[PDB]
């Protein structure tokens, strides 16, 4: 049920934010973070996150996921292989700093890899004439657009289990826009015509909160 | 024609990348960078990006963009200043830190904030079970997909000025995904049946190579 998050950086700040309510452990070994964690609904664990004993410590084991940022690629790697010799089945998401050390961080046992300064550098170099694309990526992800992404998946006996995408109209019938169907590790991201559903396959669309249930109640039994 | 960079952080060097070709000036104050810069065919200008002076030399003036990230929100903040004491119309897309500050520095002048931070740990924690959100986002803005984000503007007198997004059917017609347009600094994404283009709208699509064709020719008068 819980989340472990190891290391501290702006980045964390802004994820627990979004996880107030469920169960959340920071692991990090800097003191002068404690308030900050404690008043995010959250609980602190002092120790390095580099050291197996202190993973221990912040239950890793059995975590539902844990989140790794460190001060470096080189540390964030570390803590990942620490996380292993552990667990080798908790889904390890972690941050780059640097695009090279992406493939490193994916080799130490990460199952997804999120870098914050290449999605920032792409967006500002796209932001020169019309910011649209910065726009869109920093809305749809805030709490308070009308407009919001989400993932719903297909249930077993769905009605949509062996329908192609183009028969299925989901636009104009429940007003949400598929941007990608996913299963597993795999995204599709704007599925060709011919693409048929299976039961599993998450839909990842855009749409107004009663788009989004006019869709789920479209698919269900 | 020229883009005029200040200060230098790991969103820079991504940027670059995206501007090979495109004529740049980095304007910072640390020569250890110089190397960096000459490498992505860009042009390097030891200085002071706080200083008014050196904003001059940098010939911040008639630039079509400044993009500022400097080593922190306070920085970046005099920097914006800086350059509004010059040239008070063009384009500042700056880089913030701390979500606190987004609103000083589009108040000291920037048309435009990214957060990289706040984006990242926004992904983080909605990487938790699937991490399709994040794979999306990532995805769509390299330069190596199959799908991209494209920005098509309608021109005058084109065939789809005064239809409606309902009447357009786009999707059925190109292949391409309508995510949003956008008008000036306005964004609406996933726009209502009932939207009108004009000409100057910006659609934001996702899509082929091919579809984006289909589409830039299916507007045209
Ligand atoms: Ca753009
Ligand atoms: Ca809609
Ligand atoms: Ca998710
Ligand atoms: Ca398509």
């Given amino acids: 049920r819980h989340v472990v ?29 404690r308030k900050k964690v404690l008043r995010s609904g959250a609980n602190f664990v002092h120790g390095d996150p580099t050291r197996v004993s202190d993973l221990e410590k912040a239950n890793v084991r059995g975590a539902r996921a844990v989140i790794v940022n460190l001060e470096s690629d ?9 996380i292993r010799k ?14 090279e050390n992406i ?10 890899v999120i870098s914050p300064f290449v999605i920032s550098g792409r967006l500002m170099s796209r932001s020169i004439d019309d910011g649209y694309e910065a726009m869109f990526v920093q809305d749809v992800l805030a709490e308070e657009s009308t407009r919001r ?4 998946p297909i249930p077993e006996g769905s009605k949509l289990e062996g329908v192609s995408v183009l028969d299925a109209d989901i636009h104009d019938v429940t007003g949400v826009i598929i941007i990608g169907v996913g299963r597993g590790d795999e995204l599709i ?33």
Wanted: proline share 3%; net charge negative; hydrophobic share 40%.
């Fill in 103 to 112: 493939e490193q961080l994916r080799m130490a046992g990460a199952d997804q």
């Fill in 189 to 221: 991201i704007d599925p060709p015509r011919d693409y048929s559903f299976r039961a599993g396959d998450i839909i990842l669309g855009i749409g107004k909160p009663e788009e989004i249930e006019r869709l789920k109640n479209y698919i269900s039994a």
């Fill in 149 to 152: 992404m989400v993932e719903v």
């Fill in 74 to 82: 080189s540390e964030t790697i570390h803590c990942i292989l620490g």
């Fill in 86 to 99: 552990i667990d080798e089945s908790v889904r390890i998401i972690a941050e780059a700093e640097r695009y």
């Fill in 5 to 33: 998050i190891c290391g501290w950086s702006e980045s964390t700040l802004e994820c627990l934010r979004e996880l107030r309510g469920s169960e959340v452990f920071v692991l990090a070994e800097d003191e002068n973070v």
